[PDB]
Amino acid sequence: TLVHVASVEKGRSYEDFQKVYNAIALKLREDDEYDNYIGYGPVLVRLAWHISGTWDKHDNTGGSYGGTYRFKKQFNDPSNAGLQNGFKFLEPIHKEFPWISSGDLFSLGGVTAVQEMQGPKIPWRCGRVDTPEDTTPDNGRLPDADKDAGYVRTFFQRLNMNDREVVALMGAGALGKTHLKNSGYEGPWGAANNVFTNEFYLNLLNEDWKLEKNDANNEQWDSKSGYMMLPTDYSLIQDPKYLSIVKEYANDQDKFFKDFSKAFEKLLENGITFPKDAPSPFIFKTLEEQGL
Numbered sequence: 001t002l003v004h005v006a007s008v009e010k011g012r013s014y015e016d017f018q019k020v021y022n023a024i025a026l027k028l029r030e031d032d033e034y035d036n037y038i039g040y041g042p043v044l045v046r047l048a049w050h051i052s053g054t055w056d057k058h059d060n061t062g063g064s065y066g067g068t069y070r071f072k073k074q075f076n077d078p079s080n081a082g083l084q085n086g087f088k089f090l091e092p093i094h095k096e097f098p099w100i101s102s103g104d105l106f107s108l109g110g111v112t113a114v115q116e117m118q119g120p121k122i123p124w125r126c127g128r129v130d131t132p133e134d135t136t137p138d139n140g141r142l143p144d145a146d147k148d149a150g151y152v153r154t155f156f157q158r159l160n161m162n163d164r165e166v167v168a169l170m171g172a173g174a175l176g177k178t179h180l181k182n183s184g185y186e187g188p189w190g191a192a193n194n195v196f197t198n199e200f201y202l203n204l205l206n207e208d209w210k211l212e213k214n215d216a217n218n219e220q221w222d223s224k225s226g227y228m229m230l231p232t233d234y235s236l237i238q239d240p241k242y243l244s245i246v247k248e249y250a251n252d253q254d255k256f257f258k259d260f261s262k263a264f265e266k267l268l269e270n271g272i273t274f275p276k277d278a279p280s281p282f283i284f285k286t287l288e289e290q291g292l
């Protein structure tokens with residue numbers, strides 16, 4: 001198991017990272033038109049999870065720390081197609097703040113997007129360090145969507161995530177949508193695409209789902225309301241343990257926010273050793289809380 005010790009960007013503290021937060025949040029506001037006015041919030045949240053989700057607990061490869069990845073077929077793979085827009089969004093931020101590492105920026109982008117879409121506060125730690133010499137390909141490390149509950153449970157054990165963590169994670173605020181041309185799946189999980197909610201769980205339990213074939217010839221669960229669920233999403237109510245938790249989050253927004261917050265931060269911090277002398281996690285204020 002390689003060891004990856006967090007190292008604070010030289011001389012930086014809270015206020016420096018809140019400035020990066022603010023520029024990300026302000027660009028989020030400014031580039032409102034992206035993806036039929038969904039904006040960049042959702043792809044940023046997906047970007048943070050994708051780079052973090054390359055981690056393997058068994059040898060500590062991958063993860064957010066090194067910020068250095070090689071994306072299968074340079075994003076023209078259904079597993080990662082669409083993420084380049086997220087990296088392109090963060091390039092001007094990186095140019096404005098060249099001192100932040102890549103792992104810190106990718107992960108802070110996901111935290112910023114969640115909060116600015118009114119999701120829970122997500123504490124965030126700095127100190128990931130680029131590892132240009134050691135690149136992690138995402139190839140085969142992220143999960144397939146045409147699978148069942150056992151697949152999902154087993155996949156996530158590699159990320160040291162349990163049933164609750166997994167169900168909290170996948171709902172992912174019901175942000176954004178699947179795009180047929182990226183992934184071979186089409187449609188949103190809910191009606192409020194760029195607001196962080198527990199509506200994934202509600203829709204899953206309350207919508208009338210039909211198992212259909214999309215124009216890419218892949219099966220997905222569809223509702224007359226125009227929502228969709230991937231086979232892996234749907235499995236969360238086919239498995240009896242997952243189903244209980246789905247119901248729990250459907251019925252308690254605050255519990256879901258708190259569980260999501262813990263699991264997302266954990267996900268974003270996997271693979272990383274924080275010195276005992278490391279600063280405490282930062283909780284960034286939103287633009288709205290700052291009156292900006």
Ligand code: HEM
Pocket residue numbers: 042043045046049081082143144145146152169170172175176177178179180181182183184185230232
């Ligand atoms: C079993 C695990 C999961 C599967 C199979 C998977 C599958 C998918 C697929 C197929 C898409 C569509 C990509 C495209 O068409 O644009 C996608 C979207 C997305 N994923 Fe995942 N995902 C899973 C886990 C996660 C989790 C844990 C998060 C974050 C906590 C998440 C975040 C998102 C978000 C926010 C998008 C929307 C992107 C956009 O609107 O541009 N996913 N995912």
